[PDB]
Symmetry: C2
Subunit: 219 residues, 2 copies
């Protein structure tokens, strides 16, 4: 089985060929990071920073998002939310329309879940994420988000571009910890709680466009 009506059909081959998809799309240091050989960084309390994705998979996902074109979002109301009122608006493309929600959920349940279990002793993860979308921030389309938390036990923020070369500006700002993640990594990602002990704030971007993929896991 191989759906040929796709720009990058190998992206959905995770179910058919897990070994090849993992060897091609996952970061080379992901195994080293999971094995416990350093790599993981904790610049702020109750936060982590380890490599998750590689250049090829990130570029393919960015190209697919560009091919989708319909950069929805930006209005206070939400059409994909049951309540119909979204607290924070941002220009983003949902994974449901793109059809990558199932593949991303499987990838998170395979690789992301063991990482979360290893980082926090005594914590069992079922990888139940109800919201997963990639937001594109532009100097004229979507500015930095207002200071707000995430409606999830843990919130993961993954960058999709190389810092500096692709976009100029900043990332987030932890007001509680008085720390700012000013050096995002294209291949790495952060998985920290955002329910009660994290009042996340968005820093602004001056030049270029920045794309970040955040999935609300365990809500």
């Amino acid at each position: 089985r191989y759906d040929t009506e796709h720009l990058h059909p190998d992206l959905w081959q995770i179910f058919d060929n897990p070994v090849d998809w993992k060897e091609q799309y996952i970061h080379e240091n992901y195994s080293r990071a999971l094995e416990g050989e350093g790599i993981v960084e904790q610049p702020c309390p109750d936060v982590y920073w380890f490599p998750l994705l590689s250049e090829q998979m990130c570029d393919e996902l960015v190209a697919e998002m560009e091919h989708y074109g319909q950069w929805s979002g930006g209005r206070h109301e939400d059409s994909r939310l049951a309540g119909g009122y979204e607290n924070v608006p941002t220009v983003d493309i949902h994974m449901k329309q793109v059809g990558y929600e199932d593949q991303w959920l499987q990838l998170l349940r395979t690789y992301v879940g063991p990482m979360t279990e290893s980082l926090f002793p005594g914590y069992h993860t079922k990888a139940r994420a109800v919201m997963n979308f990639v937001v594109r921030y532009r100097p004229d389309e979507q500015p930095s988000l207002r200071p707000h938390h995430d409606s999830s036990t843990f919130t993961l923020n993954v960058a999709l571009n190389h810092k500096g070369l692709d976009y100029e500006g900043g990332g987030c700002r932890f007001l509680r910890y008085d720390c700012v993640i000013s050096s995002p990594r294209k291949g790495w990602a952060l998985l920290h709680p955002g329910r009660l002990t994290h009042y996340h704030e968005g820093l602004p971007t001056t030049w270029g466009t920045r794309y970040i993929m955040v999935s609300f896991v365990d809500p």
Copy 2:
């Protein structure tokens, strides 16, 4: 209305005359702590230790618990829980059996909630608590519990007796923070998250009986 069918009928008079209950039950320095001029202590990161209840209230609660006699608990399985299995068995009496759960909820909504809102900016509290029981820590009966977490956004623990004079032992130990509560206060209460960022293990009591109050807030 003043029902005398209790050892301490004034313990149920929290709502009848809120001023009288606040004046005769709450901690004298609790108002100063709510004013934000000290008293509140943070021995560990993202942890609070401030006085909540007065000695008279603690004595009344201890006497009521002793007179109740329904000190159930001690098995991995349980009948009070809907699931029927308790993750961490403990000899504790739920507030539902005593019937003071309404009073505890009212006190949490009146005094605990504003402190939580003031202490942690950007968070809204609604005093949503379900699991709350008083467990007596006895070295001969209930030894130290294994390290575990809490299935709630926040956890509150209040001492019910003077350590050393009444019981000999320890408090809690933060596995991921290397923080040990060796000098807990009868009036002070421990408020911190217990879902993901903190793994805690209780220290073992040695002599006497240590009475503690456990409440799962925002489950």
